[PDB]
């Protein structure tokens, strides 16, 4: 009858997303205490989200009016992949549902007889808005419809049935500060101190966390949000961490924060991923500045050269700003939940920000935490269900990311030559063989949930260009009519939206 | 044009012929060869949640085909006496509702109003108990309801539909299937129409499997080690449906050595006894069925059937694809027979070999077909593993029989975790997570727990949703007409 006590260790994005979500879900029925270090800094990045993100704010009962201005937040409709196939060309991976004609996806029709040479513009409306720098909403908060006009879906069904599950760019520090206010206004205890030790009982479970100036803080469930450190799960409980470095070599990153005149430049409604000599560079647009970073493998490029490459790429306005060098831990823990300790965030695992899935992992974890929340005698099946769910999301996204590099047609430097000599898991090698003949569907991809629908695999395959696809033979005998009218309908609405929608700065100037 | 030759014309063949001709047409040539001495099986009266998409693909409105086939509506399947004598529950064609991330059945396990989950969580469960029509007397209406109909009448209707679009029809005996060098099919030899050749051959010859199983020697994987029901005896009983109404559902009444189906049609009921030989002989299986229906079924002829339970090792070999009973079959507990056909012909259009036969296309089709069979099979075993009835030797053996290691493990999860999208059969097999919920909750031999989180959650949003369902049901029952009144008007 006494409220279960949850102790959260870490004041990063993971920690406050957990505290606010847990407190919103259970209210005063659950006591939440968040302990964070005052000397240890947060990772400083993580500023683009995934198609899942809208569900998180809806669960928190937060409208865009309340949180977006305080975080310098902007809209994200897609990820623009630049120069991944050949110099000077780009394609979008949009957060938009794939339309089908007579049981066949529009991309399959596009392979038979597509209008233009860009699959993304023909099959996705969002690709036209991105190329025009358009805001998804008119000057009155009206989404893609001039006149005005919610939904109770879970996270998975949101990104599965919502036609336009767009995302956001935002400052990772401002969001954490906002969620700290959201949490503390709902009864979340805040303790700023260092956790010196994790005291375990006789049976190996966490008894309490030993702080320096606040004594022993105990509880029933301990949540590790200490980042790459893994203070509780990896260090204290000794849960082994498995690396993904063998399939995804990128281990390093260097990032800047560049204040720019977001007016002459404009605010592009997407994250850009420009392919480079030893990796790729991200461009995350915000209100007032852009967040840019070079994700690379240091075996192909020195940290010194990587920073200079990044500064040249942005230009003179980034010549003197501080550069943040990060050594990434790529992979995941063998299990994210052992005994009474569950890791959420960088402590659980991480893959390179190629598709901005970092915050997605956190969002998925806390949702699965509520779903598999213990209150009785802790049934092993509950913990097993959580660990398999979290691992499948990680393992699935990892396949999707390797596919980016196996599909890349770029082949100039040693880094991009080695991307095809590197050994892949046998599972993905077989699906690629299936995908060459049978364009990816719900039955030839990774079987368990991992946030990626078939049209995502379609977009990366069609856009990166090295893996040749074919249109299914049935479309050579089908009446192309209906498909050509669907192609026309997409082109028509796109032309209407581009000519009627405002830029983002215009939208954000109108409060 | 690509030449497709279909052997067999008993629902499997005509659904294939009409679907292909509507999908492609003129750019594909279809020839159907059916025996004029060998008949259809000839049952298959109830359908599944997929069936509406089939008629929509054929561009057929309900009024075009339903009266011609004596068709009625199927809102659910009523499982009777599977847990205890006199108790029943429904497995409806209605989406499960979610409150704060948890399915309504999970909330019901925590603090449900009534002792009947189906009445609390499903609206149509109230309509079934009240014998309501899903449509008003003026045609008004996610509810993927199915149909009951005469399989014989639908076959003739589709034949007309097929031949009205260029499907070449031949009535003759296929006496031989001649194989070329590779082992593919050159042509089939008829009795007096000569050889009929083509590029693709479709085996729809039923349990015989003349083309796939006999001519090409594709092995058959038996499911009888986990599903012993191998026999069936069926009747067609003309009735004054006005007196006792037309139920908007298929009933599955558990019996001493199996179960009995009751399929309501226009002017008659389709009913049969699915059973296992070791527990019941065909003669007393007939006796039981007649006593179950009554004096109205004392003189009507009885159709005895030896069922082949399982699936072919592969349904597509070389240039031959088997569709229907030739591909595989499981007992009609959930009416998945025509669903298997509808799925197969849809996969056939998807994996159509208009291109010069890539092995990956054939591999994809066989995987889709096999997993639907394996998934449904797992779902049907759950009916018997979950059934609390324990009176006869037949029902006691359902708890000592062999159980797939995969099933046994995810059952142990379901007892705690409850069926979701991540702990069921991971590939498409027509059954959503809420279908598994209904069977477990209804049959009652397998106990379940609510999620421990719901003990700490605010019930307000859930209690509101239960009330919203009961209110909508109360209104619908009071305003909707009988299913009989509906068809009597139209
Ligand atoms: C280069 C890089 C780029 C990224 N890009 C993206 C992106 O584009 N989109 C996206 O969604 N995600 C991205 N991510 C991931 C994202 O940044 C993280 O998931 C999130 O921002 C922070 O997760 P975290 O709190 O676990 O990490 P951290 O910021 O490291 O959290 C650590 C917290 O725990 C505290 N702490 C640590 N040890 C102790 C201790 N003994 N005692 C007390 N407190 C302690 C620390 O003080 C700190 O508050 C990126 C990550 C990196 C490294
Ligand atoms: C007891 C029982 C109950 C069932 N209940 C349901 C239900 O409730 N709901 C549902 O959806 N499905 C049900 N089914 C399945 C359903 O009956 C079938 O899916 C469908 O109705 C018939 O499939 P078929 O054409 O492959 O079989 P068949 O009817 O046997 O087709 C055989 C055809 O091929 C011809 N033929 C055979 N050999 C030759 C030859 N050498 N040469 C030329 N022609 C040949 C025959 O003349 C015949 O026309 C049930 C099946 C059984 C046995
Ligand atoms: Cl990321
Ligand atoms: Cl069936």
Author numbering:
A (entry chain A): 4 to 152, 158 to 519
B (entry chain B): 6 to 146, 171 to 519
Which passages does the manuscript contain on this structure?
However, there are a number of flavin‐dependent tryptophan halogenases that can regioselectively halogenate free tryptophan, and therefore have more potential for synthetic purposes. It is suggested, that the halogenases utilise O2 to oxidise FADH2 giving C4a‐hydroperoxyflavin, which then reacts with chloride to produce HOCl.
From this, we found that SttH from Streptomyces toxytricini gave good expression in Escherichia coli and catalysed the halogenation of tryptophan to give exclusively 6‐chlorotryptophan. The X‐ray structure of SttH was then determined at 2.7 Å to reveal a dimer, with each monomer exhibiting a box and triangular pyramid structure, as previously observed with PrnA, RebH and PyrH. At the interface with the triangular pyramid, are the catalytic residues K79 and E363, which align with the active‐site lysine and glutamate of PrnA and PyrH. In addition, SttH residues H96 and F98 are positioned for π‐stacking with the indole moiety of the substrate, whilst the P97 carbonyl and Y463 hydroxy groups can potentially hydrogen bond with the indole NH. Other than residues between SttH G148 and G167, which lack electron density in the SttH structure, the only differences evident in the active‐site region between the structures of PyrH and SttH are those of PyrH residues F451, E452 and T453 and SttH L460, P461 and P462. These residues are of particular interest because they are in close proximity to the active site in PyrH and SttH, and are positioned directly above the α‐amino acid moiety of the substrate, tryptophan. Each of these residues was mutated in SttH to the corresponding residue in PyrH, that is, L460F, P461E and P462T.
